[PDB]
Amino acid sequence: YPITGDGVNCRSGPGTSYSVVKSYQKGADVAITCQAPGTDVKGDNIWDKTADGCYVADYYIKTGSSSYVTAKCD
Template identity: 45%
Template structure:
């Protein structure tokens, strides 16, 4: 199984604090998946690192990019998990095939 990975490590308890004092929800990466974290919203962007199985990721914003097929269907949505770090939403259990966060500026 080819897995496209693109995410950053998440906080504990399903929430991660932001500097502004707000909180952002974290989401589970699909079971058994080591997810690639990329420098932009697509498979053509540089691979930065790979998240281990069982990771959770924050979603700060989302943006359209390369279509990827994963355990949660085919999606063009990419999740921004940190500054300059993106993962395909097709591998993140958000509970929907739509946007769960604001669009990235």
């Protein structure tokens, strides 16, 4: 799914307390392997684990939902 934020952090866990691993530019498109609850970002507290293995706040990914579109991370 595509990134909608203008430079979005990808963190080592589902929340803003976790270290930043890398970033994506707006219009990057990422594969989401699973989703996990975490810090609320503007009403969406889901975090999306990408194929890079780090988590992007779902607020900044265009999935057409503020809830789950994939399996919950185990």
